[PDB]
């Protein structure tokens, strides 16, 4: 039926929502990290936003630069197409500072230090709930 398995659905996320997240995060971190959206590049290429923070100028400790890959459940992405879906997205933006701080403490990541004590921080199964 009408579920989020359309190349139009994926495009909508890539064009409307994904750049909004990337730019919001980059600006929130005062450009301490460069954000790049892996857009929809054909069937089999999922959309996801990477947040990278290289060039550790005044930070020395862990030998791992910030490389975060944010991914979200396609069901939730499907919901974004609805009116309450946009409302879901708006709620997620309001909780950016909250989830960000949560990830720092839990995932061993420090955005201010532009470094991490992990090997690589991949975040899957995320939703736009807050």
Could you list some keywords that capture this structure?
alpha+beta
Describe the 3D structure:
By secondary structure, the protein is of the alpha+beta class. The protein is 40% helix and 22% strand. The chain has four helices and six strands. The protein has helices at residues 7-28, 74-79, 83-94, 96-107, and strands at 34-38, 48-53, 66-72, 109-110, 115-116, 121-126. The strands form two sheets. It has a four-stranded mixed sheet. A two-stranded antiparallel ribbon has the order 4-5. β4 (109-110) and β5 form a beta hairpin. The longest helix has 22 residues, at 7-28. The protein is elongated, with a radius of gyration of 15 Å. It starts with 6 loop residues before the first helix and ends with a strand. This is DUF5594 domain-containing protein. Residues 6-129 form the DUF5594 domain. InterPro entries: DUF5594. It comes from Burkholderia pseudomallei (strain K96243).
